[model samples]
Target: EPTIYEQIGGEATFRRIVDIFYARVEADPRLRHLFPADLEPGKEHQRLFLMQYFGGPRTYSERRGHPRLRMRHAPFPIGPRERDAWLEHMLAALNEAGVPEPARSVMENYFRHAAQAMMNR
Candidate 1:
């Protein structure tokens, strides 16, 4: 079976997803506190990370060394509230971005699990 990266429209799809996700995060009071004031670098890193996560290019690890997502996210105090809020924005981004078919539902499921796993409280 093929990876979900291209199955979901690949680079462009992930890019748009992150873009919309961050736009919502920027204004979200609940999530706004966790992110750095500067989101540009974070946005690019996310695009690269998600791309690699779903099995696209390895630029994320190539450029940054390792994903170690849990270690990276450990700095922030993410609990149930933050997880739900973050997942909500991601689902909204997917909705607004028009991610197609199995990809949309697949990503939705992936986000749900990933969001829950990342919680630290």
Candidate 2:
């Protein structure tokens, strides 16, 4: 079985999805503040993080250590609303990327879990 990243075109697809999602986040006033205005860094972070999460590489962990994700995001008040909006963007980006079918549902499920897990409140 291909690794999820391999099935989705590896780093390129991940970069595209994260870039598109961050663009929307940058445009939306509500979500914009949740991220740094400089999206390049944010994109890089997502690239590394997702790359590691989806079995692309260990560079993310090697450099960033354990991604104490919940604890890291605890400073934010991510309730159900934020969670849903985050999922909404991820779904849109995934669609925009034309993510391959075999990988789509798996990615969706993973995103849903990640979004829900980010909920700090």
Candidate 3:
């Protein structure tokens, strides 16, 4: 019950989340300027990372080395607005993906917290 990965449908859930979140990021004028010209890399990165975060697999660390979540976003200007924007979009992704019960609550809680954790400005 604690393993969010299984409850959320493992790979498919993360993949769906990545797709939905990126599309939201891409469409948002404020956030769009923050991303690169290409989104494929991030799409893969998030899917793998979230999968591992929820106890799916370690392909993320094995393939990309230590996550260093903060280090990765340290270069970005993540203020309150930026953080909330990301948080909202990811929550929407989880909702859209049909994450159930505590799994949804678990992911929602994680994203809200992590988005704030990324706030550097």
lDDT of 3 at 83: 86
lDDT of 1 by residue, 1-118 (tens): 8788978888989989999999999999998888888889999998999899889999999889888877888999999899989999999999998988887898899989989988
What TM-score does prediction 2 earn? 0.92
lDDT head-to-head 1 vs 3, winner: 1
TM-score of every candidate relative to the true structure: 0.93, 0.92, 0.96
Arranged by lDDT, best first: 1, 3, 2
lDDT of each: 0.90, 0.85, 0.88
What local lDDT does model 1 show for residue 49? 91
lDDT tens readout by residue for model 2, 29-103:
767787765667667877899888887988888878998888988878889988887888889999999898878
Ten-residue stretch with the least lDDT total in model 1? 1-10
- Candidate closer to the true structure by lDDT (higher is better), 2 or 3: 3
